[PDB]
């Protein structure tokens, strides 16, 4: 949260090695090296495990390569591995489709290192639930 | 609750009734019980604003004529063919 | 340019006229003459027609003879009594409507 | 009505002499003399001027709002003075001034020489820029329109003469 001039976020997955057909040169025209993307991303993110896709800011003006720090993934990507079905939209409102419990996506939503809206824990519980029910799921909470 | 100012009609027939419509008025009648029918003239613009509410046709109306409060209820209303206007209204003593 | 010319596209099949037939007559040559009354447009000789009954097309073809009385005029306007007959059409029934339509070519360009 | 009700104010040094419907306004930079419509009545009192309608006229208040706005622009005109900055854009567009006449080349076969009427004076600090200045809001607007009248910008690129506050919104070249 600063200003314009190079601030962009796009990816396919954390587990990927940045191949050409999924993203390649279609990530954009910057000047920052695409080989060096596999250095500072592969300093922190790869260190333990890489389950989910993660976006990030650029913040570069005059000096060589990207100087950014990685942040947390979205909530939509948490609806595949640790919740249930990956996509299965089909016809969302013609039936109940799938479901999520109150205990599910509670401890997973709070895995975010350092980013929130408001100090209240009860507020942030159902904030991350907002990305859920967009695919026409049922609420059992 | 609903107060309506009224006056006794001097003349009768369509000739008088059509003259009242040009002057922003309209004819009316109050009947029922032992009391005989009374011919009544009412203001177009005053009654048009009151009838817009749904409580006009449901609740009891107190007509004031010659210094006399008579309680009546609305029975039938002859509306104008195409314009939002009135022709004649039937009142019942209650 | 050589390629653009090669193209042969006609994009218009607009009706020239629409007519309803009544009181069929018999002819030796075409086998039938269907009396008609044009409700809209102008009926022409060599322009193709679409014969339909109850919104579905019973038969299709191109007019061979357009004849009113003994005049045999090549053109009939709307709301003027008209006469019609065609070869290879066996059954004439009242209430159906014949749709005549002109054929035009839009032309094509390469790109 | 809402304009005319507000009293306009004259700064220090501004002399206002009212012989009749004609109103002479003078100050630091130049002197102007307009003529009122005759429907309006103007009152001079203290360090301000006030406007309003007169009896026996249909227009009434609507003309008093103009008479204020004309005389209000004269007060800023005689003291402060207005400015109109019109920049040229594109290839082969240069601007200069020689005395009272402005010599402009807008890619034509011959140079365009525009005469400045009244006491309007201009200067070109940059070759692609023209800065007009004058004590009349009427003439500075009209003279600025005459420069833009020679070359009206086509909005595919945005070349030609434009105002400083104006915005030229371009579009694409379609497809073959």
């Amino acid at each position: 949260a600063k200003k314009v001039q190079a601030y962009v976020k796009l990816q396919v997955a954390a587990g990927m090695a940045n191949p050409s057909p999924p993203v390649g040169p279609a990530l954009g025209q910057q000047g920052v090296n695409i080989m060096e993307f596999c250095k500072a991303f592969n300093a922190k993110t790869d260190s333990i495990e890489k389950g989910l896709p993660i976006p990030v800011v650029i913040t570069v003006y005059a000096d060589r390569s990207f100087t950014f720090v990685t942040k947390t993934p979205p909530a939509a990507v948490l609806l595949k591995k640790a919740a249930g079905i990956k996509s299965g939209s089909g016809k969302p409102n013609k039936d109940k489709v799938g479901k999520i419990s109150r205990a599910q996506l509670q401890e997973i939503a709070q895995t975010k290192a350092a980013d929130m809206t408001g100090a209240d824990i009860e507020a942030m519980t159902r904030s991350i639930e907002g990305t859920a029910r967009s695919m026409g799921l049922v609420v059992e909470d | 609750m609903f107060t309506i100012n009224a006056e006794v009609r001097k003349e009768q027939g369509k000739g008088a009734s059509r003259r009242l419509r040009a002057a922003n008025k309209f004819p009316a009648i109050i009947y029922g019980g032992k009391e005989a029918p009374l011919a009544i003239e009412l203001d177009h613009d005053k009654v048009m604003n009151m009838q817009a509410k749904a409580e006009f046709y449901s609740e009891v109306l107190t007509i004031v004529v010659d210094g006399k409060e008579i309680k009546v209820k609305a029975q039938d209303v002859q509306r104008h063919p195409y314009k939002p206007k009135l022709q004649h209204i039937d009142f019942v003593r209650a | 340019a050589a390629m653009s010319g090669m193209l042969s596209p006609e994009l218009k099949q607009q009706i020239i006229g629409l007519a309803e037939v009544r009181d069929v007559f018999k002819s030796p040559k075409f086998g039938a003459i269907a009396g008609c009354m044009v409700t809209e447009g102008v009926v022409k000789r060599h322009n193709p027609i679409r014969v339909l009954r109850d919104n579905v097309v019973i038969y299709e073809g191109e007019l061979e003879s357009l004849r009113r009385f003994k005049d045999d005029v090549n053109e009939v306007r709307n709301g003027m009594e008209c006469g019609i007959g065609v070869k290879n059409y066996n059954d004439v029934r009242t209430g159906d409507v014949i749709e005549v339509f002109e054929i035009i070519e839009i032309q094509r360009t390469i790109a | 009505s809402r304009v005319a009700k507000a009293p306009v104010v004259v700064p220090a040094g501004v002399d206002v002499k009212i012989n009749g419907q004609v109103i002479t306004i003078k100050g630091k930079n130049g002197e102007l003399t307009r003529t009122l419509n005759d429907a309006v009545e103007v009152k001079h009192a203290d360090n301000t001027l006030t406007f309003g309608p007169r009896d026996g006229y249909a227009d009434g208040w609507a003309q008093a709002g103009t008479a204020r706005a004309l005389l209000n622009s004269m007060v800023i005109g005689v003291t402060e003075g207005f400015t109109k900055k019109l920049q040229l854009v594109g290839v082969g567009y240069r601007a200069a001034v020689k005395g009272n006449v402005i010599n402009l080349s807008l890619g034509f076969s011959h140079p365009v020489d525009h005469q400045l009427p009244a006491g309007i004076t201009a200067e070109c600090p940059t070759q692609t820029e023209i800065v007009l200045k004058g004590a009349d809001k009427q003439v500075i607007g009209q003279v600025a329109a005459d420069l833009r009248a020679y070359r009206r910008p086509e909005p595919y690129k945005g070349k030609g003469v434009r105002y400083a506050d104006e915005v030229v919104r371009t579009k694409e070249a379609k497809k073959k």
Partner: protein, 136 residues
């Protein structure tokens, strides 16, 4: 198109469109379209206005048709002399007087009711106006 399935007689006289209308208010639905002007409404005209109101609202509520042609109107073709019997029925029309409700609607908002009847009103030959369900 609206037309009679059967009739006792094939043709009808010209008649007149004199006198006033009967149905001052909407009995069936909630909102509707009233005829201000005086004239007639053909089968194609009645069909065309019904499509435009239904097309704007897509598929919701319900539409009642208070009018119906009922009257066979003949025409005489070109290049034909006068007399020699009466013509043939090209179309059906309804005699519309001032006060007739032409169309009706229920189970929608009042905002969309104005839009649907305004588009329907333009197809009609005669002048029309919006009307509301009056109690009693």
């Amino acid at each position: 198109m609206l037309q009679p399935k059967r009739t006792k007689f094939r043709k009808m006289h010209k008649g007149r469109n004199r006198g006033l209308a009967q149905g001052t208010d909407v009995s069936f639905g909630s909102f509707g379209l009233k005829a201000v002007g005086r004239g007639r409404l053909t089968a194609r005209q009645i069909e065309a206005a019904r499509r435009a109101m239904t097309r704007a609202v897509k598929r919701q509520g319900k539409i009642w048709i208070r009018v119906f042609p009922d009257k066979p109107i003949t025409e005489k073709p070109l290049a034909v002399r006068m007399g020699k019997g009466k013509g043939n029925v090209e179309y059906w029309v309804a005699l519309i007087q001032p006060g007739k409700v032409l169309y009706e609607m229920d189970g929608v908002p009042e905002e969309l009711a104005r839009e649907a009847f305004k588009l329907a009103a333009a197809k009609l030959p005669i002048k029309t106006t919006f009307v509301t369900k009056t109690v009693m």
